[PDB]
């Protein structure tokens, strides 16, 4: 079926320029008109730019004209967006989109952060469990992620294959602008002599990759 | 010029709601190219109306669309507690531009109360050796979305170092919500208890760690 995949987005500096791209398969890429929508945290959507299937017929959202330039290749199945003096107001989610009539592809989107702020990546700290092997029972352990910037981190369990009771809580946006989440799993309490348990937290921006082992106290 | 929705709209299990999107005699007015998009979540917005009134294959026949004069409306019927998401609007508008409707926000009432979960985490060795402390209060399972959260050490209050996350919905429909208090080491080893207390309608549930 059809494949959008965007890839591009990331946090800078106000004036300063990023690339996104959305690569394409599925379908016959060349006979589609292609466009972008975007949308800042809790805002809602708008259109941005549109393009025509070979390449002619831009068109772009006032708030952007100027600034952005819309473009693809054909022959290697790929739009893109130029986006220049970019400043706080374009922080959004760009998804690509296929123009159609009677039906609409979206990619997943690509994270764009415009910010005087630089990145931080997170400190990660265990949660013990404070129930014992012996009390019986279910026990909570977690991980605490303090003090990143900016947003998002993905906590997972023993590299992927624990899911199961696991709840990563939305983060905290602390008064220094900078976030914190914490991830916990509910097990069996006398799982805990025998089984490891491990967070595996990944903050693309600052590429953190952290494997935390989480051991009763 | 977005096109002008409702901001929000509520209903109640099995009742119907409608949702207008009026825009200009240059989009709505111009075209039959309103659709309708749903938007869970964290997730990219779902076309469910095109050309007005025509519904992409596997979308659901409570989602109706009509269009009279320089409105749109998209009504769904039979409301479930997965329609509760975000609503767009959107139309064609000439010379490849598109307009997005400001969006509607509808909400699906009737789930009972759920008490809420509360599980409150010490501060690790790890991080005491880093001369720092913080107590992560966790709440979850709760409705409807609103607590208190009261921090207390040794039985005596505590409001400085306490950030709160609002509440918002986990993916079982109920909400969750985090409490952390920032102290230093000293503080924390200095003191016999302290208390995360949470206050939903009512009903305080409380929990204690120390050192």
């Known amino acids: 079926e059809v494949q959008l995949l965007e890839s591009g987005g990331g946090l800078v500096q106000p004036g300063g320029s990023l690339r996104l791209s959305c690569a394409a398969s599925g379908f016959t890429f060349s006979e589609y008109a292609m466009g972008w929508v975007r949308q800042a945290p809790g805002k809602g959507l708008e259109w941005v730019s549109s393009?025509?299937?070979?390449?002619?017929?831009?068109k772009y959202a006032d708030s952007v004209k100027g600034r952005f330039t819309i473009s693809r290749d054909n022959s290697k199945n790929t739009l893109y967006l130029q986006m220049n003096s970019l400043r706080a107001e374009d922080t959004a989610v760009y998804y690509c989109?296929?123009?159609?009539?009677?039906?609409?592809?979206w990619g997943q989107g690509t994270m764009v952060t415009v910010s005087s702020a630089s990145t931080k990546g997170p400190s990660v700290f265990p949660l013990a469990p404070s129930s014992k092997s012996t009390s019986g029972g279910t026990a909570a352990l977690g991980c605490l992620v303090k003090d990143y910037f900016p947003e998002p981190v993905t906590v997972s369990w023993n590299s992927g294959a624990l899911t199961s009771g696991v709840h990563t809580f939305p983060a905290v946006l602390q008064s220094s602008g900078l976030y914190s989440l914490s991830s916990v799993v509910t097990v069996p309490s006398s799982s805990l002599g025998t089984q490891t348990y491990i967070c595996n937290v990944n903050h693309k921006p600052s590429n953190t990759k952290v494997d935390k082992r989480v051991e009763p106290k | 010029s977005a096109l002008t929705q409702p901001a929000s709209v509520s209903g109640s299990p099995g009742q119907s709601i409608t949702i207008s999107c009026t825009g200009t005699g240059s989009d709505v007015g111009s075209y039959n190219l309103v659709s309708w998009y749903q938007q869970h979540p964290g997730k990219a917005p779902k076309l469910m109306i095109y050309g007005d009134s025509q519904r992409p294959s596997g979308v659901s026949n409570r989602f109706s669309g009509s269009k009279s004069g320089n409105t749109a409306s998209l009504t769904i019927s039979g409301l479930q507690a997965e329609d509760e998401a975000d609503y767009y609007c959107?139309?064609?508008?000439?010379?490849?531009?598109?307009?997005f409707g400001t969006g509607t926000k509808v909400t699906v009432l009737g789930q009972p109360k759920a008490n809420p979960t509360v599980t409150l985490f010490p501060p690790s060795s790890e991080e005491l050796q880093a001369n720092k402390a913080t107590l992560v209060c966790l709440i979850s399972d709760f409705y409807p979305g609103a607590v208190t959260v009261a921090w207390k050490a040794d039985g005596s209050p505590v409001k400085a170092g306490v950030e709160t996350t609002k509440p918002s919905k986990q993916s079982n429909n109920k909400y969750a919500a985090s409490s952390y208090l920032s102290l230093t080491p000293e503080q924390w080893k200095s003191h016999r208890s302290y208390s995360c207390q949470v206050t939903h309608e009512g009903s305080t549930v409380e929990k204690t760690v120390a050192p």
């Open positions: 959107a139309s064609y508008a000439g010379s490849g531009i598109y307009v």
């Open positions: 989109a296929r123009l159609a009539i009677g039906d609409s592809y």
């Open positions: 393009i025509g299937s070979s390449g002619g017929q831009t």
